[PDB]
Subunit: 388 residues, 4 copies
């Protein structure tokens, strides 16, 4: 009825999102840089809960130890002044030329050691600022050509790096967990761990798998043509959805990072339905870029729209699930039977059950319609607010 | 020099590949059906090692117990007459209308029980014929719309089904392992476990994960725009490449199942390089469809081309890796350093190493070229046989 | 407020849409065949304006001249009984095995002559039934491999065929125009004239270009990742939008033919906005397939949803364009300036205008935001009915 | 046998290709800038025929009239010193922030006038340097959202701009023609005239269509999943292939601009076959970016590989077409019949020919295999140099 966000809705934004200056591979910046303190103050006014950062967003690369302490103290004063929190942080292992062949899986061993030391330094800072999750996006881990990267050796190096970071946080006694953010390509021709599935599988080979989960991004799974709500369901089923990046993407192309709600709107509806019905309690983080057509007024408009669209879709998904006509349709399509075990009676009783094979009437079962189109049109009517 | 296959090269083909009659979603069959016995005899003449089958390829659906025994005895005589083996089998849980919403994850519980009984019946037959691997492709597990399938409940049902099949083979004492074949879409709008990564992650949640691996198909990972050699490397790293389906695909579109070598030729080269250098010893199985433009002479031509193209690429990948100029290029691009541990000295020594951070010269490291373009042009010259 | 269609809304459906039996490349039919007369009666009850057909949907292939007249007279009685019209017809040049390498561009010359005679026979029947548009979808014109089809010779053959059909209708004095329906792939690996742009360009090389336009389909341009409203705008700008096929598609994959509104919902909104604001007056034709999960009740539900979703989106697009806040936003984003000529003053005056170059303040112009994100969030609020 | 290029092979390169500094949307430059004079000298040593440029590659933006004359005179001396030619030039209407919503179709009218004056200034310079073709890539013409751009008004503005440029060159008496370069997306969410087909159709609506053709780029049509050799065939059939940009792309993703031969190798083979057999006589221009992993030695290696791979593929395509076994296969697949008119006897004789319908044996025609798989395996053997 009213779609105004409050800090209770847990909306967070990266400093690099509203602060994106608009440089793209074919053009110069269209906006001046934003001071982090200014972004914190503006986002607080719009109803945000908190902000996230890469090390190099907060502390310019090369900074002396004294300049570092000064940048952090200004930031911390803005947080104290506004009540904003810092629930997640991450490391920039992709912008500087030294990371051109990767950080953790760079072929040069000295670069891999530097990447780990740069990361550990920022984990300490994140803990100090209260973050609960530390994200890793290995944007430069990958290759443009087949012989440049032995992927088995590279996964050994990736496992080695995350194992060492797990050793580090446990030896320091820190309460922080790691989340890997997959992306299939860009800026490398193919990036390692390209989808939520590949990241979940990798984590199971780590020495302390309980410290690691995923940080999926809407547009990145869509760059592989995959269904983002399905991949989130698999991450929830595994107990590994530690954080999430929300935005929009129009299909398979360069990573657009549009505001949330833009892109595939029906997928956004089914994602919000799933997060709210599964009781996801982490931050609703927006990793988006206000288009470079916009001035600063359009940056804040686009950030506000992220939050607005989540809250509209939350309302429509809740209306859908509460509608008694929809609940009857779900039974007509046998979603209740999907949730019942196939064979709680056990293997032997299944083998002995003639009604499951010898005397199963396949033709009668085949003729039963699933009634999915009526259910989906109810979902469409709810999304569009056209119910009668 | 000569590219003639022998049974030692372990090339296998599904009965459904050369026996595809050419029916597609817009047209009728263009070829008559092939008797399985005829396919076994023809494939043996071409140098194949063996064949694979779905239950319903070998025994027509509905078959009485007596017709069943007759179909199998004819098949077995053809195997004995030719020396052909049967290393893999699988179940058809996708053609009959009863499977229109899935087999293991159908919303109707009675269909899920029937799907398990149909599978178990064919596992017994596979063991009898000597198969070592039992493949599952869940082509109908999935959805066209968001509300039709709760994916968390569906993954519970999928895990329940594979857990019961594992219970079955272990209680029977059978030496057979399972391999899941991913596909991202088609015939369902989105299929569950859509990529090698999602399947590997799922397997780790099974009660007896050691019995399950993957059966990746070249064209299916390419339908998601992903790099198939990279996904195979991840499956090999996990110890889970139990079988493989070889074919060709021209990018993101319907599943073409072209002959191996067609489609993305450079990816085929890097796949053969990887399988041969990792010492993959399972079958080289072709899951392909001779185009419906062809008569039976073109079917056998297309099957022969599958094997020929593997053997040419095997030769060119071996020439590449043996060339001393390539070995020097690999060192110039630091592939040797990629295989060395980043920090065998351990965490504490890494933290104490000033050369890894405080005194690391990032600018000097950044200026080092990786020399990947020269290496990739050596790989291209080898593939095209243009070395001088 | 109420979304009930009437024949005045001009909604039409192909006989092959609601009559699709559910056979797909991996499974058997799940529905029995529908008698055309039954489909006409049911669609009339739902508020449809008319139906369209391929020759072989109405008259089974091989039909004797006497069976033919009988099938047509039954159909015509159903049309008379219901008030349903037949505004478009088309030819099936894709199902029968003889068309496996194409109809108009088959390499065999005798098949190309047969394809033309089969087409001409149905044009006469279409005129008799009152159709105004004759569609051609060359689903089999194309190739799976490079050497199979010289595309320059094939375009000569395609032009030859359409030129002969134009000669035929003009010599007969018929008032019917042709519309080419593009599709980029499936069932051939690549289809000729794969997008609206390629079809529009081809038409300009025909001997009588005024007789030919396009029949774009939502999901087909989306199978190439393209923006369907943009391609429709280009077809309208050229004066060539003779008919349109409405449906839904979830990105780049096999042709789903979902009901209209499903798939990319925001693109559907912008398409309806464009058709209604440009005053498109032809039929709103649905080329869709009710999913094979459905029984006949779900078929009619899915057909009804096509019409419902058009009417909801029509209402929301009209509300958007009528909102004075949106009209002010359009001026803020300078859509009014886009519609003014760049240089009605002419070339010489442009060259003499120092304000266009020598004294143009580029920095001041660059700093002007375009305000597109606020406009797009107004469009989102209107679509979701969340305006306040 | 030897693959050394000479200026006779007409290979050309943009200054922006070898001079790309490696800045991408997620990272800083990895190479220093190259002086244009140095690039001309190095490319001449490698066997190139000439170079191309944007205005802003040669003359830094903002340059005073005196600095301008100096930059051009240095360049011209390098051309004279090396024998290098300048066959094409183009305008940068995409890098500066003023072009953030387009050049010719920017919503702001003053920006559209500036874009035309910037273009005309560089056409004069191109003519002075001897260029024959002037390319336009409208990289910023397009939109991220639906309401931001009325595409019909934008195409009016695009036509207005190209009509004025045609007026300009004709009134000046210049012998130069224009070529539009399509791209479907990036950096805008959708770009206008996204494919070769849309550009060819647009040109037919210009006032003097004979002055305009296309400049297709391999990777751009592949970003839409389309077959680049087919689109080139359509451009050749229309008489509109005025220039071509050669490079490589691995499927549907961001524009990679890899060296020619990388990406889809079989498509490169069929493209070279087509250009050489159609007798394309324009420049073989490489629009590529040496990956940012490389130092300057890798830049020159990658440029050399462009030329090498064209010359290898030229040899293999010529061997294919000259092989008598291939010529017999082409007849077996009836490529000779494809080139014969379908009905040179005319419409009336076709209607009177009972052998084309009443007495056509469709079943006999349908059973004829097309023998395309054998032909395609001959093409594969030739490409890989595996003929015996
Ligand atoms: O730019 C690095 C930020 O961190 C990750 O979330 C990325 O997706 C990206 O937006
Ligand atoms: O048709 C079912 C066969 O089994 C699986 O390997 C599928 O990919 C398919 O080719
Ligand atoms: O099946 C042939 C019908 O005619 C065309 O409109 C196609 O898109 C299709 O739906
Ligand atoms: O960067 C602008 C150059 O000109 C055009 O050819 C583009 O494709 C591009 O490489
Ligand atoms: Ni992103
Ligand atoms: Ni992100
Ligand atoms: Ni396949
Ligand atoms: Ni397979
Ligand atoms: Ni379609
Ligand atoms: Ni259609
Ligand atoms: Ni490009
Ligand atoms: Ni280009």
């Amino acid at each position: 009825m009213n779609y105004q966000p409050t800090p209770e809705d847990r909306f967070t934004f990266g400093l690099w999102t509203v602060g994106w200056q608009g440089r793209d591979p074919f053009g110069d910046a269209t906006r001046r840089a934003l001071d982090p303190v200014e972004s914190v103050r503006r986002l607080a006014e719009l109803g945000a809960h908190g902000v996230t950062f890469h090390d190099d967003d907060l502390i310019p690369f090369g900074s002396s130890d004294s300049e570092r302490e000064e940048h952090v103290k200004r930031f911390r004063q803005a947080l104290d002044d506004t009540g904003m929190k810092v629930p997640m942080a991450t490391t920039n292992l992709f912008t500087h030329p030294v990371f051109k062949d990767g950080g953790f899986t760079a072929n040069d061993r000295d670069v891999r050691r530097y990447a780990l030391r740069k990361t550990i330094r920022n984990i300490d800072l994140a803990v100090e600022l209260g973050a609960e999750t530390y994200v890793a996006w290995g944007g430069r881990e990958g290759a443009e050509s087949g012989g440049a990267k032995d992927v088995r050796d590279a996964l050994d190096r990736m496992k080695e790096a995350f194992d060492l970071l797990g050793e580090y946080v446990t030896s320091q006694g820190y309460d922080i967990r790691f989340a890997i953010e997959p992306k299939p390509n860009e800026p490398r021709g193919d990036i390692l761990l390209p989808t939520v599935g590949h990241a979940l599988a990798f984590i199971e080979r780590l020495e302390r798998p309980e410290l690691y989960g995923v940080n999926p991004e809407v547009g990145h799974e869509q760059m592989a043509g995959l269904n983002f709500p399905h991949g989130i369901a698999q991450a929830l089923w595994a107990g590994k959805l530690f954080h999430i990046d929300l935005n929009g993407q129009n299909g398979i192309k360069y990573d657009q990072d549009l505001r949330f709600g833009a892109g595939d709107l029906r997928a956004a509806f089914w994602l919000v339905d799933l997060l709210e019905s599964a009781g996801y309690s982490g931050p609703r983080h927006f990793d988006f870029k206000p288009p470079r057509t916009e001035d600063f007024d359009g940056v804040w408009a686009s950030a506000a729209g992220c939050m607005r669209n989540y809250l509209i879709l939350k309302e429509r998904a809740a209306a859908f699930r509460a509608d008694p006509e929809v609940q009857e349709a779900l039974r007509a399509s046998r979603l209740d039977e999907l949730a019942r075990p196939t064979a709680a009676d056990g293997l032997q009783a299944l083998l002995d059950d003639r009604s499951a094979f010898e005397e199963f009437d396949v033709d009668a079962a085949a003729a039963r319609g699933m009634a999915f189109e009526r259910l989906d049109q109810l979902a469409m009517d709810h999304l569009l607010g056209a119910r009668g």
